[PDB]
């Protein structure tokens, strides 16, 4: 049963990236102001915060097995900090343009970064953060990168060039390119995490969300309802729902069977930019970042 409860919301400068820690009740936010914050959303106290740079930090993830966060900013740099001490672990120029998205491999010491420089790059932290591969082919800003959780030797990139490309580590060309028909670009791409469907989902400035079968490359459904740019759309890892957020200021919860909207929320923080779901579905927690702060919600 739905029953959405606000577990914790706080105001801040624009939140561009957001992520849950898998074992600690923490959420990381990365802000347009160059600040990043880690909050305990149950006690409502900051565990750690850092003024990383003066430029926007659009991407941030926990690397829990190393006790790190990894962040990427408009100053072209990837930085890694230990969240127990605040100490900076590494600081390098990753791309000659904005970093939009960072993905962390579940079992290997690999991170992917997607950039306005039209590429995705693969970095190996057990090889001194060496650049091990650059994936070329996209023709506009790479807005989102995500590993296939069912096979993380592959990953998807979503791009303003209106395509999603799916790649294999160690190979220079896409396994396939998905022509989305979302003519104003792809802002976000996500995988359905369960084994029963080979699904991906894309979000666009053209106000649509689309579901794809990655075996046949077919569009399964198109979700309409948002009134401004759709910033993200994701499958919930345990509940039969899709969650999206938009510059129209709303989050929408969609039935993942019928593809109909179940609930629209305006949490009152203006434009929505980013989303996270708790890795193990603890308390069905989700979190989203907005122009004016973030909110952590329990869905039921």
């Amino acid at each position: 049963k739905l029953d959405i409860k606000k577990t914790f919301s706080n105001r801040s400068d624009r939140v561009k990236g957001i992520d849950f820690h898998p074992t600690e009740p923490w959420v990381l936010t990365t802000l347009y102001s160059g600040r990043v914050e880690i909050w305990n959303y149950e006690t409502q106290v900051e565990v750690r915060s850092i003024q990383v740079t003066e430029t926007p930090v659009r991407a941030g993830k926990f690397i829990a097995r190393k006790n790190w966060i990894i962040v990427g900013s408009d100053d072209f740099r990837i930085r890694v900090f230990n969240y127990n001490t605040g100490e900076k672990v590494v600081d390098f120029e990753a791309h000659p343009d904005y970093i939009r998205s960072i993905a962390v491999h579940p079992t290997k010491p690999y991170v992917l970064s997607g950039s306005d420089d039209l590429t995705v790059k693969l970095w190996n932290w057990e090889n001194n953060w060496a650049l091990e591969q650059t994936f070329e082919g996209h023709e506009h800003f790479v807005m989102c990168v995500a590993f296939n959780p069912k096979d993380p030797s592959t990953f998807a990139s979503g791009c303003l060039d209106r395509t999603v490309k799916v790649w294999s580590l160690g190979q220079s060309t896409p396994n396939f390119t998905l022509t989305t028909g979302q003519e104003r670009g792809v802002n976000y791409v996500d995988y359905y995490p369960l084994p029963d469907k080979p699904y991906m989902i894309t979000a666009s400035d053209d106000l649509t969300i689309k579901i794809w079968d990655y075996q046949t490359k077919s569009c399964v459904a198109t979700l309409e309802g948002h009134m401004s740019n759709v910033s993200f759309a994701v499958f919930h890892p345990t509940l039969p729902i899709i969650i999206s957020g938009s510059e129209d200021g709303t989050l929408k919860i969609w039935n993942s069977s019928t593809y109909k909207v179940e609930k629209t929320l305006n949490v009152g923080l203006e434009r929505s930019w980013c989303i996270a779901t708790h890795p193990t579905g603890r308390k069905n927690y989700i979190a989203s970042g907005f122009d004016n702060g973030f909110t952590v919600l329990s869905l039921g």
Partner: peptide, 5 residues
């Protein structure tokens, strides 16, 4: 630049 915000 697109998506500057």
């Amino acid at each position: 630049k697109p998506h500057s915000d």
